[model samples]
Target: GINYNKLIKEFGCSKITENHIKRIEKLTNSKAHHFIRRGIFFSHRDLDFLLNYYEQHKCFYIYTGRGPSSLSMHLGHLIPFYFCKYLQEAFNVPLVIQLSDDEKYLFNQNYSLEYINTLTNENVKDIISVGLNPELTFIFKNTEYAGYLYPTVLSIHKKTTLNQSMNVFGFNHSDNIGKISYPSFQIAPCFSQCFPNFLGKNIPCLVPQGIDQDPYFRLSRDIAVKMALHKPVVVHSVFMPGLQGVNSKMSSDHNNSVIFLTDTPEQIKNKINKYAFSGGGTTIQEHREKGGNLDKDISYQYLRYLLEDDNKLNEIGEKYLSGEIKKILIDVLTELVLKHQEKKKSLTDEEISYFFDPNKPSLQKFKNM
Candidate 1:
């Protein structure tokens, strides 16, 4: 939906070339993720260096996160975590997951800190369902783990002035000061020493995230160079369109524009059937003449991102499908979401807290998937 080429130009970030994807596959001795192969995770800053450095050093921490503004995560929320899971196993590296409850509270007037914190636990469980290695992972809420990242945050605040923050984030007189200062917290997790126990000092860090948040790191990367610290290398995922299609009109308060992970099979079926934007011909025979427009179709877009089987997708798409693609997506998501729900059920409180441990044993001992 986004002109990804423009984001590459505007952000001054490199396009993820085919060779880069091939390098990842050959380097890991594993197939590159479908996300990388299909060009969804398509932009980066200094990603080549991370790969080359990993060739020799074989150690880097993966950093990616969630800001818990709602009770349940939706299908679109799983993409980065799924990609990060692949990197964790392939690179045999540790991960740091930040639950920005403090950020969520500051940004949203509707939610209290306690309620926001409550959402974090549910999101933590949702994240863990993706099969992340708990021992090699540490998850922290911002207010609770504030002290761990305090010095970095403080250092960044001092180095950054009001004018600089304003220019970078487009802050005006009306925006809250907390909102102005929030970029520091987001970038702190990217710094290697912020949580030293989880990762060694001066270790290279990689951030896998949606491209919308790139501006935070755009400022932070420059700050890292000026502060004599290591900058976080980032790999960016393209935005998955909302059920409203290309404009990404999904809002948590709105039900039609999205399908939540907690949605029932019947609900998912109906949601897609009724709301998924179609790009096929208006008539039965007219559709056969022109075929479907993948660019605007939500069903095809979801399959492009979610469906794992390339040949299967090819066959289904080849079969004069559009309305039928919705059926495939409905089946794929129902199975996936049902499995995620079942996994969430299996997680006990004690098990979920293992990820919250500050003293987590951050070992990357060749974890095999």
Candidate 2:
């Protein structure tokens, strides 16, 4: 099983205590999302400061992103974005989603820039399908927006040294210079002042990302102190387990390892049946006697991550020791996949363009870039 508690201690991030959840619920004046209430978003850094700033009438923007390594995004990719959408609506904050196409190209030697760009566009469309407000959202690719983002990237690079980069990212001498410099691109978005629209403004940033990505921001937090800028506050989510087991986090390299957003109903059902690791007993009789364990069960774990209804999820958990839990999970996943596909199908090219359009009326401030 994934040891989130151990990770929190090792990573030097604080656990999201009950008080934190209550604070978010109280601040937003609504119920917290299941992700937060259930502890899927389990660790954080300076989140208290962010909420305090919000309470004091200081504005903070949301920044979360994807490194588009594949054309097909998996269920895991939506975890952070889902919470991000809720936060955007709850707080009415601006969001900036960076498509790390350049990072993908630099890190993956076999990937061509053209291929990465194609994947980036596909991923952007999927992100837009999540219903982020176009008026308040800005999505850009590093390759396309290099000129606009480089000033900030260079500023961050000046403050960061090779030794610091090497230590934070665990980079070795053999790693390419591009890989060494990529962390600056990843962290630059955390400083709201880096963007022309907020150039002279002091808008703080709140980043919601997987815990594994925290190291990059840890360095950013350190740099923020030296520059006297408001450090980025981070809320980190636990890794979504791979379909095979809890041994590794979900990844795009293996088809069986993840359930992609584009998966068909039949594909979803078949994958769960054929590949989903189970904690049920070998025999139906034994399973009926000794219910299935969710500790390592991939299906139940997926539901814990994706299912929103607390009552319904708890009902399943209590009764899921039975063998039919597998079918129940497949049903939930199939319906979710169908709904997501339907929503994505309804998104027109014009709508997709609007999200990417820097010249749009709502985002006109950044059009000069």
Candidate 3:
């Protein structure tokens, strides 16, 4: 077992607790979401080494953002942003957000330019609403930034040949050059524009992302160690499952992918009762005697993510285990989703636009040089 307390102390993290959050911090001392604090992001990879960098006075920034694949990002899209916001408040560091419009175009041909603009802007607005300091943040869309930063992208391309890029990103020769070049878009921000001034200065960079994307950073790490610019530290989290179950993650396009901030109260209730996966025994009596499977249920996972009060999660778990609170817990979760939806509605367009603008107060100061 990792000595969780010792790790926390070594990192000088004050508000994050290991007892409820170790499964997440075990991967990267990255501050996790309220849900990950709840156990929904249960699996992790190599997060502590990143923490060590923070402890030693080496510089690091939290890099978390998304490729705009859809017009309306689901409720779960905010998981990484939510965690990043907490980190910004705690550590007070520079933050870099990349909206990989190029990645989306390569992955989904149907994703129109207009839709990409709308989705990227919408998501950026939501990120701003998370209460991160604007002075220390940078957000950019690849389409907009690509014109200026092509050389940096080309540098990534120069170092790695077709074979390397293909293997790194699963791109076949037939894939568009834009698709092959997409990884560089993400990798470039890790090194170049995120901190344009640090080219030769050699500041440390830390990345906290879901586990699936580890291979991408693994590519960046390999290149960095060779060239000796800014080798990134990485923290990884498991995929958050959909409302149905643990087999697959929630998708923004799918109606039952997960809860959404834009969903109506009726939609919340209908989705929960209709699609929330059942983790009970075949028989009601068996469920009463044996209890529900906390490991697999969607409703249970949501509680782990949203309910910060350990006592409350435990109580809900007990009710589930005893079958004493069957259906009732689901009802509670539906209501919670509705409340969150209401909160999201109050956010205005101006607030959202402020987040996407690169020239805002949230960005780190770049001298006029």
Candidate 4:
């Protein structure tokens, strides 16, 4: 429905077919995550090649990012991070998470640095609460980690021509210089040189992120030709539609379209029932007589993302095709958000220092790696 096939063509990225999934399962010696099986993660650049290289060399780091704009992240925001978490543990590889406060500051005109900085720190707590292992993960904000990232950013910017930047990001003469040059900062984490004490290991980066983010990596990969670094491998997940419909992309700014991770159980129930686009017939009797349209149903679509089991989700889908439904999705999301809220409450900045601080003794494991 989203024309992921057309995206594969336009973006020049490969579709993740069953063979690829089988290879992933074979290499990892574990069942691939449901995201792969469900086609939530739909495409890749060099995933097969990376898997082949990993079978031989056995080391690579993952790079994915979050640019925190709001204090509360919606359920749609968790897709890539959760997939990245699965990737981290399954691959047994270190992950570098760039909290791009600099990008947020530069791109959005009204948001102040202090506001973005506060959101960045708070967002990191939510990110950490997803259970990325600190021993194998390093989280750094662009502003806070400027010392390490800026040099690589400069090097990348130097190699990247002005036209190249403008072409990739659609920069106009009216756009500020900082906004034009911001891609370099976004791309820097793909190189190991951006991290402190990551001694002598020039491992390739594997980026698991949303498909909309493919442009940054594509530009970075092209720059890799100039930078003399490995082109980062990328696996891209499809966008989750807003509660409105498949045509709508979820945005934190939109109230009805997004279900924030901070929403109460009652609010979650009300929001889903009220705003979730239904594809069923108008009347209950008519719905039974004429089956619902599964393709356009937001509830059915979301269950594809959130529901873990194949058989169970299949049954739910069949049930929904026959009649309209509610209960399961609300229960799943309610439980999901509540656990995340609980996990976030116990997380203090002091508690997460090792993950965010390069100077922390625990982070010195990078030197050994």
Candidate 5:
């Protein structure tokens, strides 16, 4: 077991209503091969079958990356990397992390190379903080690795047509050639040179990412098919919502929309109480009578997403729905985020740099238990 339980149990062991679990399971086929089955990979597009590969000892590389569109990363961003880290250790497989600076640049109208660079550095440190194993991981930012692996980039381009890329990425004719062909930059490392310092070439890659990004890998897999290459296996997670609840996934541009790892205690407290979508009733008296809807409330959802203590999470959820758990989830998030902020603040410049350093190891070594 990969302590599959721990990942979900951490948030006071929050349990979804049976109906919610069944709804997710129905769409996910009992979550057979997905990362969500292990809890870290919570939401996905047909990820269950991907997990089946691990059960049979099917060798594969793991891939996940950051957009680095912002200077700081929030808990929503941690979802993919933490799980990918777990999968890498569980399979003893190599993992490739893409900085995707090019993708960010191509997509954002207000993009600046300088801003992209800063975000990339921050994202890298955040990944490192998750305790990934350095020996098995590769971090390639678009600006750096693109030049190093030009041939792989060319190969990906040849197989991926401009028209196809346009349809997949919704690119217009006005889009730059670099923007038009950026999918290759995103796809190439999955095939060639992820671990050039080690394997050199030819390893199957598995990407663990959000469901919203399915179009990219759809193009990658199509190109792989056309090029007669082994397609990268993709494990997708669901889009994590922001403090505004399930409807509002975290956004980099909105300050009040996210709880960044670097936010101060005041910031965390204010954000959660004021901005985090409330799950309780309109009034305390009404809440006492009707209880909250755990499914729709943002704070309660955070518990499901971040808290590891299964028993506690469930108790909290139950109490909230039963109209007894008034502010437990919000309190927990406020405390946790503030504590994380304090720890992050205490990190010296050297320590922060070390945490983000690409040359160092990224995660902890664990077993399939």
Candidate 6:
């Protein structure tokens, strides 16, 4: 597993403490999502400032993104969007999701522009299935919208020196210029005015992202001040471990390592039974006698991140440690994926177009909300 204490120090972020959770619960008049309560979104920078801005009745927005490198989005890919949904609902704020297809093309070897764009469309559909309200949410691909994005990208680029970029991303001279320059595009959306929806307003933006992506926002926060814009606040989530175990985060390179959004129930069953790393003793007798290792078990790890109900998760853990191998968690996951696939299939071209249409009446209505 990763060292979160070390991470908090290295990334220069504050741990999300009980006081923060209590304040969030107080302000929203609802329990904080388990992700926050359980420390999945464990790190933050200037989150207090964003909450203070909200308290003052100022306009603010949410910005989070995905790099569409593959057609299938896995469970690990859903965490940020899920948290973003929670934030959007809790605060009644507009959200902007950037599909960084251009960055995927530059980084992924031999990926054609056509292939990446196709994946971008597919990824957007999956994101829609996450139940983000289209009225308050805008999803755009950099490939199609770079004309609008370029001016802000250029602004951030000028403020960020090559030395800063190299220090943050560990770039070498041998890397392609696109690789060197892509940070500007990734960092551009943190500025609120980049989207026409929030034009002429200095809307503070809060980004929910994986801890790995913190460096990008770290640089963005510095440049935001230099450009006299409100610095972006961020909530960072820990990486979801690959099914194989905690050695690495889930990856699409191996089908067994991830539970994809499009996986069939049978595929889900087979993959979990065959590939999900167990925390049980090697044999039934041994497991019954000594109990499973809840700390290191992969199934328990997945449930820790995925299961929303703390009581249910604790009960599951108790049963798991008592040597009962239950399929309830697997059943829940299978039903979720199956339902998502059905939703994706039911979407039409006309409806999908409305999601990307900036001039939709609902889009204007949300700004007033």
- Local accuracy of candidate 2 as per-residue lDDT tens digits, 184-288: 999888876556653235578889999889899988898888777888889999888888887778888379778999998888888888888998888989888
Ranking by TM-score: 1, 4, 6, 2, 3, 5
User: Which run of 10 residues does model 6 get worst, by summed lDDT?
Assistant: 320-329
Q: What is the C-alpha lDDT of each candidate?
A: 0.85, 0.83, 0.64, 0.83, 0.65, 0.83
Q: What's the CA error at residue 26 for candidate 1, in Å?
A: 1.5
Between candidates 5 and 6, the lDDT winner: 6
Instruction: Name the candidate that leads on TM-score.
Output: 1
**Model 1 off-target regions past 4 Å?**
362-369
Tell me the alpha-carbon RMSD of every candidate: 2.5, 2.6, 6.3, 2.0, 8.0, 2.0
lDDT of 5 by residue, 244-293 (tens): 66776676736887888887766776776677777678888998888888
For candidate 4, the TM-score is 0.94
Measured on C-alpha atoms, candidate 6 has an lDDT of 0.83
lDDT of 4 by residue, 1-369 (tens): 467789889988988899988998888899999999988898998888789977886667788989999998887788988998898888777788999898899889999999998898889888998888877778888888888878889889898899988988889999999998888988988888877565335577899888888889988888887888889899998889998888877888369888888899999888888888888888878888876778888888888888888998898888773223556788888988999999999987677887865554444444554
Clash counts per candidate, in order, are 0, 1, 15, 0, 37, 0
lDDT of 2 at 201: 54
RMSD of 1: 2.5
- lDDT per residue, candidate 1, 1-369, as tens digits? 467899899998998999998899888999888999888898999998999988887777899989998899887788899998999888888888988888889889888888887898899999999889887888888888889898999989988999999988888998888889888999998887777665667778899999888988888898899779888899999877788787683456368788888899999998899988987889989888998877777888789888888998787666646668888899998999999999999999899988877675455232211
Give every collision pair in model 1.
none
TM-score, one value per model: 0.95, 0.94, 0.80, 0.94, 0.77, 0.94
Worst 10 residues of 1 by lDDT: 360-369
Candidate 4 minimal-lDDT segment of 10 residues: 360-369
Q: Model 3 TM-score?
A: 0.80
Instruction: Output the lDDT of residue 121, model 6.
Output: 90
How would you encode candidate 3's per-residue C-alpha lDDT over 1-369 as one tens digit per residue?
233345335433223236536543443465555545553343333445545555565345778668787656665676777677776665556677888877887788777788777877766656665566666777778888777557666777778888888876788867788888778778876664445532223555656676556667777777776666666666555566787777776777367756766666677667777777778777879987888888777677666665667888788887774233335545665665555545556678665555556655434342221
TM-score of 5: 0.77
